[model samples]
Target chain A: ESADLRALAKHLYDSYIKSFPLTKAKARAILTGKTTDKSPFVIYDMNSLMMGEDKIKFKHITPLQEQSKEVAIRIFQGCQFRSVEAVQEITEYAKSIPGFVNLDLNDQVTLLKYGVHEIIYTMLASLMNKDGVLISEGQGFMTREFLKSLRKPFGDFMEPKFEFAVKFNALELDDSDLAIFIAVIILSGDRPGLLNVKPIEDIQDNLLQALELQLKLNHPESSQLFAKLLQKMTDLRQIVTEHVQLLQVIKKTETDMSLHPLLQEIYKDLY
Target chain B: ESADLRALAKHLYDSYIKSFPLTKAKARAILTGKTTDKSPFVIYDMNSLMMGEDKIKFKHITPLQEQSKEVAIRIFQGCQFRSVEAVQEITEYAKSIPGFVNLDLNDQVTLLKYGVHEIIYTMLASLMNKDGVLISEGQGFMTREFLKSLRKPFGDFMEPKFEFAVKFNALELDDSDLAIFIAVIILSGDRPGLLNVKPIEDIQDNLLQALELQLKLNHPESSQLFAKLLQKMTDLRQIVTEHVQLLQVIKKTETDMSLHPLLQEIYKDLY
Candidate 1:
């Protein structure tokens, strides 16, 4: 059952925004740390967090000095849990769709296997903007420069998302737009290992047509915005490819940090 | 010198239409075997040719009944030459673009290296329809049933192109839209290996915008034509991936046939 929830949401279109009836501007503002939504968590500007001054940055985090390695691993562990929790919500969301559960059980799993990461990455924009991304629940902000400055493997891991999310947010889509957008991600027919492709394609085509209509209606004055969103999906594939590659690198080096087994299961047969 | 022309044109957008001044209807007709385009050759419906007729089909060709092994190799060999010739024209087309040659020399070569198959296959559409493909210079027709009937390695080779081209032709682009569309494929930032992605992205962004505008202006009544074309580019990448895999299979089996060294150089190091 948990393995069902272990799939990664790469597209970021997964489910977060569906939870809150947030507008594009309000959600965008909250994500970028402009809102006074208070919580008892210290949000690290990850850009500024792992910045140039590695020695000084450690003290800024957890008062651990060089021992910060353990704490850094702890933060990543927190993220692992977040990723796990996100998958369950994504699965429930997938099941809620009309024809999704009716698909071959294996095909359903395969879609989630590939679809999860795209959904997660798509949903991430809800919590991300040009500057950086929030860790979880608006508790923290991690700046891009700090993400870039992160230690070899971890730093490169989070790097591409900022560039992706910033451009993604520019489209200014709200929940209505994302509902079908996420459906488009789930029902994608191109995820390499698909079976019963024609049926999947039928479902996907309808969703895309509807999504295009929704985009047209939502952003009436915008030129080519619908096409632009599809282009972003292509970009999501590359970013996830890179994300998987880094996951491999981290595994090979056996980074002292332990990752959630859920992630391992999600990316396990991804290729 | 020939190596420069070896790159396979996967996108079909490479060039061919610009030369003939054909409308989509006329060109479409020529490809599907409707026109009296004079030629001194017989066309094999590749689909039916290979269809489960190992013994009988051989007699349908050149007075060489059971000796069709060599003859079969010979036909494949002719295709090799066609592929080589197409590449040079593809190169000339690439050079003609304003910003293409201005790219880093290595990047230009890399684009051609990765882009060749896409261009060649894209052009194959001009010779293809739902039923089968036309052989070089429109001298013959190859039916889908014949292509499907060929021997193991060769039969599988030409198979997917029909599916790809049929959908591609539905977009009904003319030479002008293709002019920029081809550029988008060549300058694509997603190609595996590249020296300068940023500059290539800059070039590609402009071309995509122009192509989008062209699609809009040309197909004004057609809803989502621009997005549909971009989605096709996404599809092209997958088709080419499968194309490369089948090429590898043919290589290992050594197919009793020889391929042009030009194709060898083109797919070499592609992964």
Candidate 2:
């Protein structure tokens, strides 16, 4: 089968969205809560490429500007990818963004901080008009095949591996949070979410280690909490991903199925 | 003209919290649709006063030892309070914290950075038990009158000032977010939060002003926010009247009001 790499990536991106916990009116939900606790969002990581700004060559195409590394780092820290390698991966992906060249360096940093790193792929897909795989961007996407290989319908989904990692140890922090509307708790610091637990020294030690690494490589000046991040990265990540996807999908679906001319130009120059 | 000092201060605090755009839960919502969209959360001056630690008095105490003059200078680089008088005010406040006396000089510096300078009075309220105050070791509060006069609150409400004070002007850099769940948007700084904003000319000016003040103070090595705070003679005149009223009111309300025990002890000690 002649695979359209971009198309496949876009397909995977669409399926990924349907698997989220909240998908309907995701934006209105976050801004208004119109849906039954459902939201539209998505979190993406482009291994490096400065975490934020990219310009789409196509007219009317919105290429996310460069964002601060802190934004993406905070979202993915202890929740998604860990290590410099993961950051690098994000960087490469940023370079691949069609409109990325249009953005200035500072805007790139802003984009990353606002979580453009987590959704650039979908942004690319939407530009290409990939509707075949849109529904999978919701909750209940945890099938063996979907979870395992993403290449085939039943094969295990392939998970990407990046470097510079910190694993949160709950036993050390002894924290807990209510799962009311949340799917998973990506505890920030020694305390978990709603369930407050005595932070064991062990968890503090783990976080400190991650902080030390961050200070050495990125910010030597920080004497604050391991890079000034204090919230659960997973929570932010899960939420951002859903919000972005809903915006892209609903907007695309509402417009004529024919590709938006600007988006068409974006796809044509994607390579 | 009668001023229920305690109620006034309490009102100030209450109104401040209410002023924030989002509720506790509403502020926490995140969207997770397409890509992971996860990003690390930026913590703005959080103090640890979680529920489990509530019963223990010492636990209720803010992590005062973590505060330091260096961090203060770092956070408020170009702040309006760049005068020696303003700098001293901060140091005096840090030294006044209840638990700080026991900490060795070095430990005191560390803790100030950890909690004291970072946490605001509203968080202190959380540390206080039913009577609306916190008690630790033999050392007691600096007096509710002191807390009341800090923010210059209007009517029965205090704004979230101290919390704002911790990281000061850095807030001007905050991005626009939905009214309902704006907190999540604030937390998406992946790595160095302010460092990203530092490049902006306006932010740079702010930081420079703060630096100038620190340099003028000879950049004291101590972590104190204000060295001459307690000894300075502020109007004890207001204190005399409020003390009389609190004493009479508590005596009348005796054991009936839902006031916190910690708050009661504080008032009793004053009389």
Candidate 3:
């Protein structure tokens, strides 16, 4: 990641800390390199990506359709599944089961999607701390294919999408990236895809023009709606590439405390 | 609506208000008026619902299948939609493409279930004011079809199984009358479901057995999961003391304030 991007990430982290004071410890550790678990990555850190303008408020009455779509998106957003290698292995694993391999892509996708959502939820929200693995303990927030989908397009967008650009710089992307990319838009807002949302009002306002389109996202209807909306809102996709250099200025000095192993034991993970 | 049932309905209303405070003026009015409307109702009167053990307190987790199913059961608890005339009218109104008539029976069931859930949610959360209505606002919670499924054998053993004796005695529920039952259960320690519960010792024992099942509504799998769960937890069929008794209740106190107005509003045409 670019230094300037790191700095921006830090700034957002700071803002997030101010917003949700309880998260300060985790936020500070993430920025200071005390942790490497990118599972609850910067996207999650800046909750606005998930909450959007509804960032800190509540609405008493949302339409049934809106509510249904919101619930669906959340479920989709929270879905988790097997890793690519594991899935491949599982596909190989499936050949052993009767008629399993004969299942169509859609059926497989449905079944796997269900499993992924369940596991990811288990990993992220309910699990606890563990060993050297920076990944989350127990259940993760998303499934394997969903996570794989994030490997490219989502990874790239995390660097470019303004919502993500605030944390990381855009890099090469591939097929795996869109799940999280699209999910963030659904859970959070579609405004980032706009050219400009001057003044950065509260989150709900971003819920303005594209609710159903966003809600229906993988559906054929939503696919067309978003296609049209994306074209119309090309400016929304624009980001501040010029800000790249800003990261260097916010650089931090590294610490190399060669503490005694015993002393480290006396302290915490200080070694 | 049987006369005996009307008295029971009045008692349930009285008990509900007595246990749960009249926190919101509008909800208080609706409760006293006993009418539901068309535009969609929001209940901002949450505090009142929070007061009693019988009043379900739902944690606002993203309303995925688990939560939705639970809420669906709660809404259907004392409700029974047996009016062929009303069903026919609502089905007609539902005829628009995205309207009602187009939906398959299962989907139709889903829609009615959602409507009931939304109404009660609006009532307690003050999501919609009392005067607001659904597209099929006059329609009660369940369709005659769902009512049949709920009264299935061993239905009472289901998670949200309505205490027919309790409900029949309390609400005097009829084929037309519906109940909005929301309650929270404790899943901690020996005996549970206390709001301000602290130490394990402080937890209440010997609480209502129904609380456990209410909280145990699992995430729906296939349609069968949804159907079976619905049948078990929200069995409103047992409360129907012969349709004759129900018609009597409807005739005598059809305009009673405790009954949702949307039903009567449509019934007015009968005269």
Candidate 1 residues B1-271, lDDT tens each? Answer: 2222122221224443442333345556675447565532434644334442333223332111123454346456556655655665566567656577678766776787789788777767766778776653553566677667767777777778888988898878776677677777888777777878998898777666677666776789989998888888778878888977876886787647423334553566773
What is the lDDT for A73 in model 2? 27
What's the number of clashes in each of the models?
A: 64, 137, 75
Candidate 3 C-alpha lDDT tens digits along A1-271: 3443333223222222222222324433543457665434212322423543233243332211222224223322222112222233222222222222222222322333322222222212112121111122211232222222332223332123223322111221111122222222222222223221221222222322223332253344334443443342232223322222222221332222223332222122211
For each candidate in turn, the TM-score is 0.42, 0.19, 0.24
Q: DockQ, per-model, please?
A: 0.01, 0.02, 0.01
**Candidate 2 Cα RMSD (Å):** 26.5
- The Cα local distance difference test for each model comes to 0.65, 0.27, 0.27
Candidate 1 local lDDT, A184-247, one digit each (tens): 8999888776666777888887677777767776689999988999888889998889888887
lDDT of 3 by residue, B1-271 (tens): 2444344334434433433232234333443355545322222232321231122223321111122233224333223221222332222222221212222333333333223322232232321222222112222112222323433221232222222322322322221122112211111222212222233112212111222222233222223332332342234323222222444554564332222222432232121
lDDT, model 3, position B126 = 26
**Runs with alpha carbons beyond 4 Å of true place in candidate 1:** A1-26, A31-36, A39-69, A255-261, B1-271
Better DockQ candidate (1, 3):
3
What lDDT is reached at residue B81 by model 3? 27
Give the CAPRI class of candidate 2. Answer: incorrect
TM-score of chain B of 1: 0.78
